[PDB]
Design a protein around this nucleic acid. Structure first.
Ligand SMILES: [K+]
Ligand SMILES: [K+]
Ligand SMILES: [K+]
Ligand SMILES: [K+]
Ligand SMILES: [K+]
Ligand SMILES: [K+]
Ligand SMILES: [K+]
Ligand SMILES: [K+]
Ligand SMILES: [K+]
Ligand SMILES: [K+]
Ligand SMILES: [K+]
Ligand SMILES: [K+]
Ligand SMILES: [K+]
Ligand SMILES: [K+]
Ligand SMILES: [K+]
Ligand SMILES: [K+]
Ligand SMILES: [K+]
Ligand SMILES: [K+]
Ligand SMILES: [K+]
Ligand SMILES: [K+]
Ligand SMILES: [K+]
Ligand SMILES: [K+]
Ligand SMILES: [K+]
Ligand SMILES: [Mg+2]
Ligand SMILES: [Mg+2]
Ligand SMILES: [Mg+2]
Ligand SMILES: [Mg+2]
Ligand SMILES: [Mg+2]
Ligand SMILES: [Mg+2]
Ligand SMILES: [Mg+2]
Ligand SMILES: [Mg+2]
Ligand SMILES: [Mg+2]
Ligand SMILES: [Mg+2]
Ligand SMILES: [Mg+2]
Ligand SMILES: [Mg+2]
Ligand SMILES: [Mg+2]
Ligand SMILES: [Mg+2]
Ligand SMILES: [Mg+2]
Ligand SMILES: [Mg+2]
Ligand SMILES: [Mg+2]
Ligand SMILES: [Mg+2]
Ligand SMILES: [Mg+2]
Ligand SMILES: [Mg+2]
Ligand SMILES: [Mg+2]
Ligand SMILES: [Mg+2]
Ligand SMILES: [Mg+2]
Ligand SMILES: [Mg+2]
Ligand SMILES: [Mg+2]
Ligand SMILES: [Mg+2]
Ligand SMILES: [Mg+2]
Ligand SMILES: [Mg+2]
Ligand SMILES: [Mg+2]
Ligand SMILES: [Mg+2]
Ligand SMILES: [Mg+2]
Ligand SMILES: [Mg+2]
Ligand SMILES: [Mg+2]
Ligand SMILES: [Mg+2]
Ligand SMILES: [Mg+2]
Ligand SMILES: [Mg+2]
Ligand SMILES: [Mg+2]
Ligand SMILES: [Mg+2]
Ligand SMILES: [Mg+2]
Ligand SMILES: [Mg+2]
Ligand SMILES: [Mg+2]
Ligand SMILES: [Mg+2]
Ligand SMILES: [Mg+2]
Ligand SMILES: [Mg+2]
Ligand SMILES: [Mg+2]
Ligand SMILES: [Mg+2]
Ligand SMILES: [Mg+2]
Ligand SMILES: [Mg+2]
Ligand SMILES: [Mg+2]
Ligand SMILES: [Mg+2]
Ligand SMILES: [Mg+2]
Ligand SMILES: [Mg+2]
Ligand SMILES: [Mg+2]
Ligand SMILES: [Mg+2]
Ligand SMILES: [Mg+2]
Ligand SMILES: [Mg+2]
Ligand SMILES: [Mg+2]
Lengths: 93, 46, 271
RNA sequence: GGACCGAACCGACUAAUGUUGAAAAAUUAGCGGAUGACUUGUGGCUGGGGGUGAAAGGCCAAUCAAACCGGGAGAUAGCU
RNA sequence: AGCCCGCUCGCCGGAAGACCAAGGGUUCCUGUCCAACGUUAAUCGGGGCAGGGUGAGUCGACCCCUAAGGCGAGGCCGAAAGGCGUAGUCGAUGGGAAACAGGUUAAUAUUCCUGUACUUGGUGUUACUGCGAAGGGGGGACGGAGAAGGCUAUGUUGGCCGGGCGACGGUUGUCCCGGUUUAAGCGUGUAGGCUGGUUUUCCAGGCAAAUCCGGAAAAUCAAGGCUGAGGCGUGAUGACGAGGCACUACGGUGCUGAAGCAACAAAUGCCCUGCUUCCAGGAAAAGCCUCUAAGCAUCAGGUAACAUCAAAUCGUACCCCAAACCGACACAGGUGGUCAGGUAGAGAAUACCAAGGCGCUUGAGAGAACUCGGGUGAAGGAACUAGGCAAAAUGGUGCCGUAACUUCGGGAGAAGGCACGCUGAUAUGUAGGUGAGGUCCCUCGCGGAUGGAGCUGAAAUCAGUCGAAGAUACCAGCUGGCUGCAACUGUUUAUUAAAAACACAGCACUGUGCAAACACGAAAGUGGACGUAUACGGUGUGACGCCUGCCCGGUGCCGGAA
């Protein structure tokens, strides 16, 4: 069993975009920003515990951060992990 | 025409990378010199 | 059989092949093979230490029994095989107990022949005995220099040694070089001459054929610059110095043997 | 078959062009090899009086009758 | 002028197309801006700014396994630093489980969705049950060339289905246009390739053991096993599908949906890691199969079926004959692998096209000299010039014909000559290739024999016919004679020298008896070589033919020693 302490840290934010929206209303899939070191197993456990929904499967990818200038002052944004969480049919969030 | 620089990341790391430098006392002296000078980049290691 | 190629191309005009129909056409006996990767004549410093070595065909090493120490047990020659590692052919022999080994193929040996090693062996080609038990005057090959060490002398195609004398613990051998040499009488030898005597009649015929055998070109010293070789230099063809090796030692008559340890065993030098 | 003709591929014999170039070695038209001592990818080994060289003092990062970088070092300069 | 849309034109098409690895790193997509950047303008951009975008049990990495090689506990060696190396441990460019078709995004997809699969492992049952390795054996597991036969990708034509009936003479037909596609998996075990099978007994082998492998001897039976492209069936009452219909936010969404066959041609792909043949004789280790040891004994473990769970992590956008990589540039350069349609063609040459992609990021005029790249040229024809430099010329296939000389192979495509388009006939399409239905047989199947419809189809001869010209374009040898040098194919001064130089097979001299000489190395060691004088090193000469004379005073080397 994954500690609840751990599960409470792994989900960071919902991800809002046209693709995320289409994923929700076509494939019953929610898109999350999750902790960089979160595994598919942890992500599944967290969503089922914290959002109280049945998860079919988690797909994940690492987004590489862009380089961005800030008044002639350059800096690289952090890489972050995105999770496409497919909910079982009948579940809603 | 074929120029002298033909990049291979594997070859780069094996020739000049951090672990190659640490492998010998002369390599470790390179790192000491570069730290002393205050280089932002000690080696080719990415 | 020695066969001259017809001159259908300049590279073929002078080729002379040794075609032996008796040699196994199939693949070698897998349990007795090992890999043997090439050196390019470079040592463990990665430096060339013997020039003119490189390339040529890949070759597997055949484990050849030079010790011939499996005594009392007869063996039958299964087949003769080509061995790329040496000038002699080799014979796959099957011992009565089921063991297979390779041996140097003596002259005359053919598939079906019986061989044996040990003191009680018969005096027939391919049989191995201590030279104590071999008649003086006999022709032998694959001769040991130290008891139990395995054959070191007379292994190349068509070579043999003559046992000229036995005096106490030692026998005197006449080697192919002409040298008269003493060896302990407990040293084993195999009766007969090494086979494939026609080996020396081969004519490679072209530059490429030497390259297949992993020999790279020799550049003459006199073709070089002084910085490269003692013979180097000159406007046109010049020489005008005593011939030497690349390292400056005289190379036409100067003797280089220097081994006081083994001098006692040499009854007479080759010349 | 280090055979022949000929593309790919590898070379580089001639000419013109170009020479503050399109290019710090090329382009165009022709040219040689093209199953071999062939060619090529990836990785590896050889280190500077050292390597490697089918030998031209060739090549060793556009650098070679002794690489490059740092040091002895403000070498020395009866010369400008 | 340069952006977008449209119509036309031109260019590439063994690429100037499509895609991988590498290398790069957001360049990708959308909106917005045009200062700078872009060799011009720019409303455009690989430019600025903002937002979005990369979804995996099966693809790759990681992982298991090793090659060259690296490192290397102890160890050996070395003033120190260090060198070398054993056990080991790393190291791919190689070996090792498994997924396909269709659909979808502005931008990902073998990753998402739909349909249909497959692999490995952990649990739990149930039944049956000798399991067990750091050890043994097998396998994995291997070259070059050649030739076929069987196939498929693919193409062509016919049939079938849908559409058309023509801006100008003709075109309801032997007419025109388009489509005619469908996977892995599963079942079947074919063309063909290889191999005798089975049961006993015995045994100096495989570091011990072995029921395994090896060896020996009988008996018995002769077809048993293994491998295998493709086809066929199923997958698929599906998917896709030319069009049509309804909407357009004039970008394109929604709905429906015909035929979906056959013949012939056919790879450089597959069967094939095959077969034949040759000498230069062609990795390793694990996974995998099998054997036992110590050990464990109605246990663990093994095998099979079923159920269940798991298969993480990282990569995944985009560029790659390049404006994104290597070349300081948005640079005529360089960059490994895969795919490869039509007509003509021997062809991956070449011409024109397809799919697809582009018109090369200054234009507009003008129509001087001169320069560059080309076209043609009266008469002459090398008179040019250092030199026929450059140009012009030759150029194909078939048949005829072909000298000196020669190492008997050559020289030779020597030289030189003739034919060559189209139409018709032989023959409404021939010789040949392919092969259906039927027929009969059968050890009734992907079978055998015959049969020969249909399809495909050279080459020749004869007769005719058009042009100045029929290898019509592109493409595509100039030829011959005497002679120096080097035998030859090769190699070389990256970037002014390709040669007569280097190498070379062959020859000779010489050293070298193996802990070899010799070489790298204060050394240990290593190469020489897991070679052994028919071998190895050094030196000179340089195929082959005929040959290689005299001098040992000098210098060297070898030997002698009173
Ligand atoms: K041999
Ligand atoms: K030579
Ligand atoms: K000289
Ligand atoms: K040198
Ligand atoms: K010279
Ligand atoms: K000279
Ligand atoms: K390489
Ligand atoms: K130097
Ligand atoms: K450099
Ligand atoms: K346009
Ligand atoms: K403008
Ligand atoms: K991993
Ligand atoms: K498959
Ligand atoms: K992708
Ligand atoms: K581009
Ligand atoms: K003008
Ligand atoms: K020609
Ligand atoms: K000549
Ligand atoms: K000559
Ligand atoms: K040349
Ligand atoms: K040369
Ligand atoms: K003399
Ligand atoms: K003398
Ligand atoms: Mg999924
Ligand atoms: Mg992923
Ligand atoms: Mg950061
Ligand atoms: Mg040599
Ligand atoms: Mg020689
Ligand atoms: Mg020279
Ligand atoms: Mg000298
Ligand atoms: Mg002279
Ligand atoms: Mg002189
Ligand atoms: Mg000297
Ligand atoms: Mg050739
Ligand atoms: Mg060159
Ligand atoms: Mg050219
Ligand atoms: Mg050619
Ligand atoms: Mg010179
Ligand atoms: Mg250079
Ligand atoms: Mg110097
Ligand atoms: Mg000083
Ligand atoms: Mg000064
Ligand atoms: Mg324009
Ligand atoms: Mg084509
Ligand atoms: Mg990459
Ligand atoms: Mg940017
Ligand atoms: Mg863009
Ligand atoms: Mg501008
Ligand atoms: Mg941009
Ligand atoms: Mg895989
Ligand atoms: Mg070591
Ligand atoms: Mg140690
Ligand atoms: Mg490993
Ligand atoms: Mg690999
Ligand atoms: Mg894309
Ligand atoms: Mg082969
Ligand atoms: Mg077909
Ligand atoms: Mg081919
Ligand atoms: Mg992609
Ligand atoms: Mg441009
Ligand atoms: Mg370019
Ligand atoms: Mg290339
Ligand atoms: Mg072309
Ligand atoms: Mg097109
Ligand atoms: Mg003009
Ligand atoms: Mg002209
Ligand atoms: Mg004229
Ligand atoms: Mg005229
Ligand atoms: Mg004339
Ligand atoms: Mg004249
Ligand atoms: Mg004149
Ligand atoms: Mg000319
Ligand atoms: Mg011309
Ligand atoms: Mg056919
Ligand atoms: Mg003359
Ligand atoms: Mg020559
Ligand atoms: Mg040549
Ligand atoms: Mg040059
Ligand atoms: Mg040149
Ligand atoms: Mg010479």
């Amino acid at each position: 069993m994954i500690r609840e302490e751990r599960l409470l840290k792994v989900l960071r934010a919902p991800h809002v975009s046209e693709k995320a929206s289409t994923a929700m209303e076509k494939s019953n899939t929610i898109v999350l920003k999750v902790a960089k070191d979160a595994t598919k197993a942890e992500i599944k456990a967290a969503v089922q515990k914290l959002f109280e929904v049945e998860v079919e499967v988690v797909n994940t990818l690492v987004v590489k951060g862009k380089v961005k200038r800030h008044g002639q002052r350059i800096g690289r944004r952090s890489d972050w992990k995105k999770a496409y969480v497919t909910l079982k049919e009948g579940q809603n969030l | 025409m074929k120029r002298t620089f033909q990049p291979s990341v594997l070859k780069r790391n094996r020739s000049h990378g951090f672990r190659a430098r640490m492998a010998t006392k002369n390599g470790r002296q390179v790192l000491a010199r570069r730290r002393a000078k205050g280089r932002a980049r000690l080696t080719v290691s990415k | 059989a020695v066969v001259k190629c017809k001159p259908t191309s300049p590279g073929r005009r002078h080729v002379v092949k040794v075609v032996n129909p008796e040699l196994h056409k199939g693949k070698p006996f897998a349990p007795l093979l090992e890999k043997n990767s090439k050196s390019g004549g470079r040592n463990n410093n990665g430096r060339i230490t013997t020039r003119h070595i490189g390339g040529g065909h890949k070759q597997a090493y055949r484990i050849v029994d030079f010790k011939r120490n499996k005594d009392g047990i007869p063996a039958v020659v299964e087949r003769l095989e080509y061995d790329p590692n040496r000038s002699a052919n080799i014979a796959l022999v099957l011992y009565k107990d089921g063991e297979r080994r390779y041996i140097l193929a003596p002259k005359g040996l053919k598939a079906g022949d019986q061989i044996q090693s040990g003191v009680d062996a018969a005096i027939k080609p391919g049989n191995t005995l201590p030279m104590r038990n071999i008649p003086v005057g006999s022709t032998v090959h694959n001769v040991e220099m130290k008891p139990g060490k395995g054959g070191q002398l007379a292994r190349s195609a068509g070579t043999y040694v003559q046992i000229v004398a036995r005096d106490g613990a030692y026998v005197t051998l006449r080697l192919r070089s002409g040298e008269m040499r003493k060896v302990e009488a407990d040293c084993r030898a195999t009766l007969g001459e090494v086979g494939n005597a026609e080996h020396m009649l081969r004519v490679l015929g072209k530059a490429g054929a030497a390259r297949w055998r992993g020999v790279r070109p020799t550049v003459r010293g006199t073709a070089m610059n002084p910085v490269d070789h003692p013979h180097g230099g000159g406007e046109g063809r010049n020489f005008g110095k005593h011939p030497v090796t690349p390292w400056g030692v005289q190379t036409k008559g100067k003797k280089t043997r220097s081994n006081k340890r083994t001098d006692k065993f040499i009854v007479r030098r080759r010349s």
